[PDB]
């Protein structure tokens, strides 16, 4: 009886409390009036000439 089976273990170590992660959600720069309307102004110009 020299068996050395590889049965899985059952250690207790728990996933201790999560640290203070930096939840820095980047503030998506909403395209301002000029940035928002530049494409539409270009399209309107493409027709105005």
């Amino acid at each position: 009886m020299q068996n050395l089976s590889k049965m899985q273990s059952r250690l207790h170590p728990r996933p201790e409390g999560e640290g203070g992660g930096g939840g820095g959600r980047t503030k998506e720069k909403g395209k301002s009036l000029q940035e928002t309307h530049k494409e539409m102004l270009k399209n309107i110009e493409s027709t105005n000439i």
């Binding site: 009036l33 928002t36 309307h37 539409m40 102004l41 399209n43 309107i44 493409s46 027709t47």
Partner: protein, 106 residues
């Protein structure tokens, strides 16, 4: 054309009065939203001409590319099929020669 120009003039005067009312109410956001909505609405005209020119160019080029690429795909299919069957034939011939030589040597 003159009737439409006058109607546009009336629409613009109404828009100016609406802007005046908004300013008196300090509702600049509403005015900006109205301008954005009108900009989104109007969009295009006559640009459609060269738009169709470009679309025809792109469709012709991409259909030619599709036909070409189908050509290379069929080329590879037939070439690799020929390679595989020739390899199988050579393997069978080699096996037959091996068995013949083995029997002769025994």
């Amino acid at each position: 054309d003159a009737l439409k120009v006058k109607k546009d003039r009336i629409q613009f005067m109404a828009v100016i009065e609406q802007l005046i009312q908004m300013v008196q109410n300090n509702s600049l956001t509403k005015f900006q939203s109205m301008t954005t909505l009108e900009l989104e609405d109007q969009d295009r005209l006559r640009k459609l001409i060269f738009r169709e020119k470009e679309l025809y160019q792109e469709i012709k080029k991409l259909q030619f590319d599709r036909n070409q690429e189908n050509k290379e795909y069929d080329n590879e299919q037939k070439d690799t099929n020929l390679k595989i069957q020739n390899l199988k034939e050579r393997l069978l011939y080699k096996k037959a020669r091996a068995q013949l030589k083995n029997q002769y040597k025994e």
